[PDB]
Amino acid sequence: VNKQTQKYRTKLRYRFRQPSVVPLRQTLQQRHNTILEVLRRRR
Amino acid sequence: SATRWLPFVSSDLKDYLNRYWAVMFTVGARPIETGHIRHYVSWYCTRMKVVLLDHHVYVEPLRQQLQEASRTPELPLLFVNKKLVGTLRDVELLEREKKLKDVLHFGFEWRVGGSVAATNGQKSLMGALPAPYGDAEFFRGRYRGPPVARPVVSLPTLHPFAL
Amino acid sequence: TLSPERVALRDELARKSRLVASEGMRYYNIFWVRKPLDTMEKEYYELKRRGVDHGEAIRKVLQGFYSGLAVKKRVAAIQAEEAKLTGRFITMREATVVLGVLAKLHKEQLT
Amino acid sequence: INYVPHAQLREHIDKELDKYVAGKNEPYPLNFVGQMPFLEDGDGNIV
Amino acid sequence: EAQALVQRTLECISRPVSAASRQLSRTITAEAVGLDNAPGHYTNFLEWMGRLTET
Amino acid sequence: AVPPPRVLGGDYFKTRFGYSLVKNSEMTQGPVDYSQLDMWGEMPRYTSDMVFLYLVSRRRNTYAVAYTYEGKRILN
Amino acid sequence: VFYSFVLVMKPRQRRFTSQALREIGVAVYSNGGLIRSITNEGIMRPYSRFRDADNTPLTYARYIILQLDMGEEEMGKVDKIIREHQDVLMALKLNNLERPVGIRSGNKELQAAYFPLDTFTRLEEEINWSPQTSADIYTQLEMNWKEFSRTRWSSFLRN
Amino acid sequence: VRLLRHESSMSPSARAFSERVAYHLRRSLKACPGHIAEHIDFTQLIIQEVLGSRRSKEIYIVWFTVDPGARFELEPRLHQLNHWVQQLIIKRVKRRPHIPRVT
Amino acid sequence: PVQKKRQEQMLYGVNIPETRQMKFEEQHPLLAGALRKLEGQPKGFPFWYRKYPTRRHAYEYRFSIPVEMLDGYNDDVKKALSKGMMSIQEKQFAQEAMYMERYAEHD
Amino acid sequence: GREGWLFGQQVQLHYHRFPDEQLITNLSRWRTGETVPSPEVYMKLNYKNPATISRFLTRTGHMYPADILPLNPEAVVKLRVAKAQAIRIGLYPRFGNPFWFRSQKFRPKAYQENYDPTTYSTKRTVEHFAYNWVQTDRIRRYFRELEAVHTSG
Amino acid sequence: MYKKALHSFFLKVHPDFFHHNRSQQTVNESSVARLNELLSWAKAFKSGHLQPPPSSSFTLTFYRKPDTIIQSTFELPSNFAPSDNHRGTVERAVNKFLRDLLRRAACIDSVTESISEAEDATAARAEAKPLRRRGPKSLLDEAVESMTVQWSLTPAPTLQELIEADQILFSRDLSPLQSAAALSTLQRHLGELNYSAWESMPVIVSNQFSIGDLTGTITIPWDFTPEQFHSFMAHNEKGVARCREVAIQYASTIEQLIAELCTALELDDILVSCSHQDALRLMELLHRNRELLIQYGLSKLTLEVGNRHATRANGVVIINCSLTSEQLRPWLKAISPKLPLQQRLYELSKQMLESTLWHLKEFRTMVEPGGVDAFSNDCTYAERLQWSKELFRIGPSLAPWDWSEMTFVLSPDVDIDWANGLLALPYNFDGDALVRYVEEVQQEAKSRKREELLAA
């Protein structure tokens, strides 16, 4: 490919990209809810 | 890979249901109600196909068929596992009743009686057994529970779409 | 469902009758169209029994359809003319429009 | 298809240029775009 | 009211009358278990589970 | 939500606003042919006596120019 | 139609435009080609103002549709005559007339499955439809429309 | 949030990166996806400054409107542009310490 | 497709199936089918069909049309289908058929 | 006064939405045979149709993303060559979209700020029979000429 | 198997082909209705639910075209019962009756009716000695689907489509609610008893019991039992056949003279505004005076027939019905110089009509309104054309808003109702002022929305 097609290919590669879906904020939210249940239920 | 990439489009509603797991048909003039369903579905890590009905080639075929599956003319509509979930009043009810997890992930709704939203600590029965001869109200000295507090005046909400 | 040759036949006959009734005759209050459409269908089948042609059969059934629509138009015009000349008979549309305009004149009297 | 011969070329060009004139007792046809163009008179001056 | 009376006479002759199937119908619906077109098997289970609760 | 109120006639509609619907020029013409559509049909309708004020904002500067309907600069 | 051109020309006097079209037609006929059609579309106001040889922006322009059947080398000669004309501001060369657009770059199975005579035998107005053209107009030509449209004004003449 | 961080508190590379984000945002704010641009009223939009963290892990574009009652007309659509801002940073801005989260 | 193109170049009616509807006709009927239906000059059955079993036998005109098909038309239609109006691919296929006339074992 | 206007004008209950529609619905119900791409789009995706080009473009005249406006793979090529060929000879502007509001299916009302989908299921067939004041004088003149032709004829 | 046979049979004896004889048509309608109900309860018998038939043994009569009256009897066994044993022998009886109707029609082969006779003999031998067994349709199942999908009669029109048909008339001298009681309860639940060949008759209500005072209509007074109407139509069916026949003959004898006058004088249409019995004399007078109108300059002009000798400004002339031959020549010499003026006014009126119709349909396509009415008011064609072109000019400016609730109408005074669907405009209205008004409504709505969002 030439320069124009290579630039358009990397533009389409950065535009349509499949990210890594790692459930991190839901893990921390479940940990927060468990800590709230412990702190409410036991003093 | 073996075939060039093509955008999917069809004039039939069931062609969308048989293809995707979760389909949503929105309009561009309603940006808030589509954003709450985007927050709920992406919270449970579910792949979702959002179809903006503004600038579509089969608007009047799709606007007619969405009136048959859902009797209300309300957009957006969530469609999971070839079934109708509904608008925001139906999605927020399943999130409140803790049913939105198994609807989005496994395509079924819990038909279990009783609510799991009003729980104290862990969930148990705690009086779900049938009482002999009824008479739950004629015991006037019965255990009423912990004292519940209620607001005097409504505090000003931060946004009209904060919820 | 429907037979596909009958589907193409009804498509051609509907597309050719739409231009005759709307742009040709300028006749929009046509009543009981299913009997002219079924008689031109059965006339096409009668012409396909002997097997004359395809386009000429459509021309002949369109001429018969035009004659039937013109005869129905003249019958409706004759009946409307004799209903307006005597002054004794009044159709139902005139009745509901009279009972609507007198109701609105009484609403003007309410104001 | 009605082709234009070499002898009937100038007359066809003069007939096509006289399609949009100011004085005409006939309705003017629409263009290829579907829009009525500007009418003119003789010698090509735009009205 | 008469067919409601013959329902309670059949169950009072066998056992003492237990008011537990009426409460179980509210917490357990018919379509949750899978018995929509079988009302007879649904009510046969509700008094079977209801008398099993009072033990 | 709610519809705006009803106007019954143009003679007091001329007094309710700063314009009038019925034109009083009485333009008598016979153009039987189809009318010529504008190039920009879906636009603000700029009449002849309307001044275009252009405000150009920057980080350290802000410029204000006023042009006529025909593009003549009114003030520097 | 083998070739089509949309000539944008300067609104000069009638004699100058007639001389320009006559020179274009005699360049077509002198190279052994045939004119299918030539139609004037009047003076229209384009969305972009083209510049002439002396760099003056023209607000008005005349559009002329010219359908020809010429061989490839002679079409190149006539195209270099037309594009270097003093009156012609712009002229696009329609070369997608025998084969429809979207066959060569579209589906590879639907490449040799078309018939070039279906588009070659008809005119340019039957390939590229104007907004006024529709299938009802083409069905009206074969439906004996003379005996049917005589009663279309029987309702408006009395009111 | 309660306060806004000063330009003296952040890194000089953070100030340069935020200046590049401000330049490319004020330049091409009309070059958004057209299905969001048909609803954004650009007459009220004002992008006053861009702030960033010390290693540009997040960027905070600070904005307001001329009329405040139009703010809720410009609030959700501007939040539909976060991926477009990220792609604009990937395309237009070189020497980016991190591909930032837009806020 | 590179074999279907040469099959369309060589054989006459390989595109047309027994249903007499092309793959481009079934999706674009207003562009492929004829717009007007004329009851006039029906040409009938070709009795000269033995001379042209393949399109390499008739390269004197455009679209491999034989000279027996061009009888009732005026000189403008016959001139628009002449050798001077052929495209580059048709001229190259005519050059190919010139040697195919000379060196083929069968037709 | 006049007598042909009485026999020419017919009294209507409702006029129509557009005066052809009931004939079209009857012939479409017979055409489907039930008991009681588009053919003109690819033909009009050309340089001479500025509206059919503009019904697939955005407000600034450029292209929509593929997830928002999906199309047939030949229709996008027809659109992309039709826009360039119409821009080249000045039948289309190089920047802008002069037929954009003509193409939007979902339009808000004049007294509303956004479009709501609850307006689609209106189906107001004039259940209370609203008679306009411009029709009432026409009805009164019709019945006055009816009485005038009853008195003489 | 039997598709070609039943196809040719329903091609021969269908009532839609018999238009020269109305009695043969209605007898064929009765016969195909009886045959449809016969095959209906036969399919019901094979389905499982057995009901007593409306007729056990009866002769059915059809009419044939020579391109010939075919009568066939249907007989039932004397031991008939709704039991399971008689559900098999009744299929062979209707199969023998249908093949007996097919044999006399001379449209089938002898081989296929021998095949059906062999099938029925095999079933009659198989019902006695019990066997076991573990598909193409018979004569019955082919006949029911050839009746339903191809050769069905058109269904009876409802009363709702008869309201807008101008076929339901009434004389108001009884009362409004007497006509309401004669319509509502006597056409909804009693229309099923009404005949299908009756449905070509328009219905008046009046004082008397008669079979017509107008051309091709029938009247029916105050509330009736349906058996009274059934005995009424069984008493004078010849008169209601002859009235329909003379109405169709009257319309055809009008239109053949109309067509010959349109083709001979090169005009488009003849308009009438008088009694047609008075118009026929003028029509035959102009038919005898046909070449003299070509000798004069009266051509390519649509002709109206009124009572006063006059000429309208849109190009049509008005000729009185009462006119003799010796007065016809000074009448033609009177209006002879006014004829090219009427021709140019007629062609200009046609051009303005097609121009305003084109502008109205372009306004309907661009803006998509609730409905446009420019033909309500008595105005000149210049006012209507100017109003349509002014609406077409502001078409793209009204495009961001939907007007499917409001009606654009021509008016002598502007009436902008938003609670109702009315937008009434004069012929000379400034369109940019209307665009400014709608933009003022839009900015007041957006200011109301902004103040509502800022108040909360």
mmCIF file with all atom_site columns, C-alpha atoms in Angstrom, chain J residues 1-5 7 9-10 14-19 101-102 107-113 119 132-134 138, chain K residues 273 304 307-308 364 370-371 376-378 396 399-402 404-405 407 410-411 413 415 418 422 441-442 445 449:
data_model
loop_
_atom_site.group_PDB
_atom_site.id
_atom_site.type_symbol
_atom_site.label_atom_id
_atom_site.label_alt_id
_atom_site.label_comp_id
_atom_site.label_asym_id
_atom_site.label_entity_id
_atom_site.label_seq_id
_atom_site.pdbx_PDB_ins_code
_atom_site.Cartn_x
_atom_site.Cartn_y
_atom_site.Cartn_z
_atom_site.occupancy
_atom_site.B_iso_or_equiv
_atom_site.pdbx_formal_charge
_atom_site.auth_seq_id
_atom_site.auth_comp_id
_atom_site.auth_asym_id
_atom_site.auth_atom_id
_atom_site.pdbx_PDB_model_num
ATOM 1  C CA . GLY J 1 1   ? -77.577 32.085 -9.650  1.00 0.00 ? 1   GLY J CA 1
ATOM 2  C CA . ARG J 1 2   ? -75.491 29.156 -10.879 1.00 0.00 ? 2   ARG J CA 1
ATOM 3  C CA . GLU J 1 3   ? -76.785 25.602 -11.266 1.00 0.00 ? 3   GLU J CA 1
ATOM 4  C CA . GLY J 1 4   ? -73.795 23.558 -12.455 1.00 0.00 ? 4   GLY J CA 1
ATOM 5  C CA . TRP J 1 5   ? -71.874 24.216 -9.239  1.00 0.00 ? 5   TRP J CA 1
ATOM 6  C CA . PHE J 1 7   ? -74.387 19.220 -9.295  1.00 0.00 ? 7   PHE J CA 1
ATOM 7  C CA . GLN J 1 9   ? -69.766 19.912 -5.870  1.00 0.00 ? 9   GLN J CA 1
ATOM 8  C CA . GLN J 1 10  ? -70.256 16.813 -3.718  1.00 0.00 ? 10  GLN J CA 1
ATOM 9  C CA . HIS J 1 14  ? -64.047 14.303 5.836   1.00 0.00 ? 14  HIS J CA 1
ATOM 10 C CA . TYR J 1 15  ? -62.170 15.716 2.860   1.00 0.00 ? 15  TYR J CA 1
ATOM 11 C CA . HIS J 1 16  ? -59.027 13.459 2.929   1.00 0.00 ? 16  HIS J CA 1
ATOM 12 C CA . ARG J 1 17  ? -55.445 13.471 4.138   1.00 0.00 ? 17  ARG J CA 1
ATOM 13 C CA . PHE J 1 18  ? -54.592 13.642 0.423   1.00 0.00 ? 18  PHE J CA 1
ATOM 14 C CA . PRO J 1 19  ? -57.457 12.992 -2.007  1.00 0.00 ? 19  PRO J CA 1
ATOM 15 C CA . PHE J 1 101 ? -34.771 19.201 6.510   1.00 0.00 ? 101 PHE J CA 1
ATOM 16 C CA . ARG J 1 102 ? -36.750 17.753 3.591   1.00 0.00 ? 102 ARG J CA 1
ATOM 17 C CA . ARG J 1 107 ? -39.505 16.161 12.915  1.00 0.00 ? 107 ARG J CA 1
ATOM 18 C CA . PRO J 1 108 ? -40.579 17.974 16.098  1.00 0.00 ? 108 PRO J CA 1
ATOM 19 C CA . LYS J 1 109 ? -43.685 20.123 16.249  1.00 0.00 ? 109 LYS J CA 1
ATOM 20 C CA . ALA J 1 110 ? -43.650 23.902 15.917  1.00 0.00 ? 110 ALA J CA 1
ATOM 21 C CA . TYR J 1 111 ? -44.514 24.343 19.614  1.00 0.00 ? 111 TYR J CA 1
ATOM 22 C CA . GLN J 1 112 ? -42.163 21.570 20.787  1.00 0.00 ? 112 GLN J CA 1
ATOM 23 C CA . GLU J 1 113 ? -38.402 21.471 21.278  1.00 0.00 ? 113 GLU J CA 1
ATOM 24 C CA . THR J 1 119 ? -46.918 11.164 18.417  1.00 0.00 ? 119 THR J CA 1
ATOM 25 C CA . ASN J 1 132 ? -63.984 24.356 10.141  1.00 0.00 ? 132 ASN J CA 1
ATOM 26 C CA . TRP J 1 133 ? -65.579 27.770 9.708   1.00 0.00 ? 133 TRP J CA 1
ATOM 27 C CA . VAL J 1 134 ? -64.432 27.870 6.069   1.00 0.00 ? 134 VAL J CA 1
ATOM 28 C CA . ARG J 1 138 ? -69.693 26.375 1.757   1.00 0.00 ? 138 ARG J CA 1
ATOM 29 C CA . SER K 2 273 ? -76.562 19.666 -14.962 1.00 0.00 ? 273 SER K CA 1
ATOM 30 C CA . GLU K 2 304 ? -71.949 21.824 -20.170 1.00 0.00 ? 304 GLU K CA 1
ATOM 31 C CA . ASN K 2 307 ? -80.968 25.633 -18.167 1.00 0.00 ? 307 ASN K CA 1
ATOM 32 C CA . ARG K 2 308 ? -79.835 29.197 -18.937 1.00 0.00 ? 308 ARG K CA 1
ATOM 33 C CA . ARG K 2 364 ? -47.582 17.568 -0.035  1.00 0.00 ? 364 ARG K CA 1
ATOM 34 C CA . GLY K 2 370 ? -52.393 16.972 7.308   1.00 0.00 ? 370 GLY K CA 1
ATOM 35 C CA . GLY K 2 371 ? -54.157 18.097 4.138   1.00 0.00 ? 371 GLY K CA 1
ATOM 36 C CA . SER K 2 376 ? -63.094 25.144 -1.259  1.00 0.00 ? 376 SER K CA 1
ATOM 37 C CA . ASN K 2 377 ? -63.565 28.835 -2.043  1.00 0.00 ? 377 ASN K CA 1
ATOM 38 C CA . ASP K 2 378 ? -65.032 30.300 -5.221  1.00 0.00 ? 378 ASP K CA 1
ATOM 39 C CA . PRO K 2 396 ? -38.352 24.044 2.407   1.00 0.00 ? 396 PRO K CA 1
ATOM 40 C CA . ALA K 2 399 ? -39.648 21.494 6.526   1.00 0.00 ? 399 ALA K CA 1
ATOM 41 C CA . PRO K 2 400 ? -38.094 21.152 10.064  1.00 0.00 ? 400 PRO K CA 1
ATOM 42 C CA . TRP K 2 401 ? -41.620 20.919 11.552  1.00 0.00 ? 401 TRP K CA 1
ATOM 43 C CA . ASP K 2 402 ? -44.295 18.300 10.922  1.00 0.00 ? 402 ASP K CA 1
ATOM 44 C CA . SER K 2 404 ? -49.592 16.269 9.894   1.00 0.00 ? 404 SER K CA 1
ATOM 45 C CA . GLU K 2 405 ? -52.107 17.586 12.453  1.00 0.00 ? 405 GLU K CA 1
ATOM 46 C CA . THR K 2 407 ? -54.884 21.556 7.487   1.00 0.00 ? 407 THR K CA 1
ATOM 47 C CA . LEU K 2 410 ? -57.590 28.754 1.262   1.00 0.00 ? 410 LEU K CA 1
ATOM 48 C CA . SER K 2 411 ? -59.559 31.477 3.021   1.00 0.00 ? 411 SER K CA 1
ATOM 49 C CA . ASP K 2 413 ? -59.042 35.737 6.118   1.00 0.00 ? 413 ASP K CA 1
ATOM 50 C CA . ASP K 2 415 ? -57.134 31.782 10.791  1.00 0.00 ? 415 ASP K CA 1
ATOM 51 C CA . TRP K 2 418 ? -53.305 25.413 17.001  1.00 0.00 ? 418 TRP K CA 1
ATOM 52 C CA . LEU K 2 422 ? -56.520 24.633 10.933  1.00 0.00 ? 422 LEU K CA 1
ATOM 53 C CA . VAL K 2 441 ? -43.386 29.968 18.313  1.00 0.00 ? 441 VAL K CA 1
ATOM 54 C CA . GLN K 2 442 ? -40.180 27.895 18.301  1.00 0.00 ? 442 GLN K CA 1
ATOM 55 C CA . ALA K 2 445 ? -41.124 27.146 23.231  1.00 0.00 ? 445 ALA K CA 1
ATOM 56 C CA . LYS K 2 449 ? -38.165 24.890 28.157  1.00 0.00 ? 449 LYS K CA 1
#
